[PDB]
């Protein structure tokens, strides 16, 4: 279990500048992020065992996202992940 | 990357978790972007629920309602207990 709460707060203020969040609600948001992190990281671990090299790359994360997320969320998440890696790579 | 989520911290969490021998530079970037996307989708719905409830802050009931009303978020995140 890790804390993402300041970062969750920053995202909240982008999508709703005028809405705050209680400590208990923030606790639930932070739990969601930890749960999804662990599901993607566990799926990524499995996919890496198939590869020539024992590495988790953005390719393993993308596959893990496509397997773990429901299909419509998966599609949008993959678009966001791909765009971030492209911009970082440049 | 154009993200609010912490790539550096997420890199460290992947390394610490011992999920593989090595982690590529792109992996924590892609992962940070997906987790940020997912936080944004939930906070957007939970914020709308808070407005609908005439509140100025998200409380647990608003997250429970936003997740429950969404067929894919319910499948991903499960039931919210309050």
């Amino acid at each position: 279990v890790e804390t993402y709460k300041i970062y969750i707060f920053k995202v909240l203020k982008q999508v709703h500048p005028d809405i705050g969040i209680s400590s208990k609600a923030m606790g639930i948001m932070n739990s969601f992020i930890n749960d999804i992190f662990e599901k993607l990281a566990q799926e990524s671990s499995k996919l890496a065992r198939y590869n020539k090299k024992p590495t988790i790359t953005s390719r393993e994360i993308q596959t893990a996202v496509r397997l773990v997320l429901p299909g419509e969320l998966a599609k949008h998440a993959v678009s966001e992940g791909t765009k971030a890696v492209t911009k970082f790579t440049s | 990357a154009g993200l609010q989520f912490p790539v550096g911290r997420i890199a460290r969490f992947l390394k610490a978790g011992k999920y593989a021998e090595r982690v590529g530079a792109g992996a924590p970037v892609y992962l940070a972007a997906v987790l940020e996307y997912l936080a944004a989708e939930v906070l957007e719905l939970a914020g709308n629920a808070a407005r609908d409830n005439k509140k100025t802050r998200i409380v647990p009931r608003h997250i429970q309602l936003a997740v429950r009303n969404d067929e894919e978020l319910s499948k991903l995140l499960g039931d919210v207990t309050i």
Partner: peptide, 5 residues
């Protein structure tokens, strides 16, 4: 009760 974050 439930103080703000």
């Amino acid at each position: 009760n439930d103080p703000d974050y």
